[PDB]
Amino acid sequence: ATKAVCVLKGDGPVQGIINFEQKESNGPVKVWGSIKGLTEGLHGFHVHEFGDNTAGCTSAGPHFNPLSRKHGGPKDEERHVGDLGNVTADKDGVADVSIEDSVISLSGDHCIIGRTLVVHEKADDLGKGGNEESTKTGNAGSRLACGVIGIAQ
C-alpha cells in the first residue's frame, strides 16, 4: 500500500503538488494532483533520472531511462520508463492531473522514488515528431517547474 508525493516548484509562476499511489508492488501507479500557473494547453510531463536540485531543474538530468530505450508516449511500448506523456492546462492556468501508469513503479528496478518529476514548457510530441530531438526529449522544451519524488504517509 505504497504512497509517494512531490512538490513541483520553479523559477517562475508554475507550481503544484502531485501524488502517487501504488496499491500493489506488481501493479499500476495512480498519479494525481493539481499544477497551476501553466500556459493554456498541453504540457510535457516526465520523471527524470536524478533527484538532484543543485543547479535547479537542470540538475535532474535526462528522462528516466533504465532500459536504455527511445523516447515515446506512455501507451507506446518503446518508451522511457519516465515518459508519462502530457498534462492539460485549462484557461485559468490550472492542470488537474489524473494519470494511471503501469511502467513506472514505487518499488524495484523501475523505482521512481528519490528521482525528479518535471513539468515542461511545450507539449510532448510523444516521439512522433520526425526530428532527431523528438526521439530524446519529446520536443517538450524547457523545464518550468520540478521537484524530488518523496515517500509519503
Alpha-carbon span 102 to 98, nearest angstrom: 14
110 marked as part of a ligand binding site: no
Q: At 34, which helix (H) or strand (E)?
A: strand 29-36
The nearer residue to Zn ion, 71 or 120, going by C-beta atoms, is 71
Q: How many residues bind Cu ion (CB under 5 A)?
A: 2
80 is catalytic: yes
Nine cell digits for residue 146: 520540478
Q: How far is the CB of 89 from a copy of itself (least distance, A)?
A: 21
Should residue 146 be labelled a site residue for Cu ion when binding is judged by CB under 5 A?
no
Nine cell digits for residue 38: 501553466
Alpha-carbon span 14 to 93, nearest angstrom: 9
Interacting residues toward Zn ion by CB under 5 A? 63, 71, 80, 83
Query: So which residues are the catalytic ones?
Result: 46, 48, 63, 71, 80, 83, 120, 143
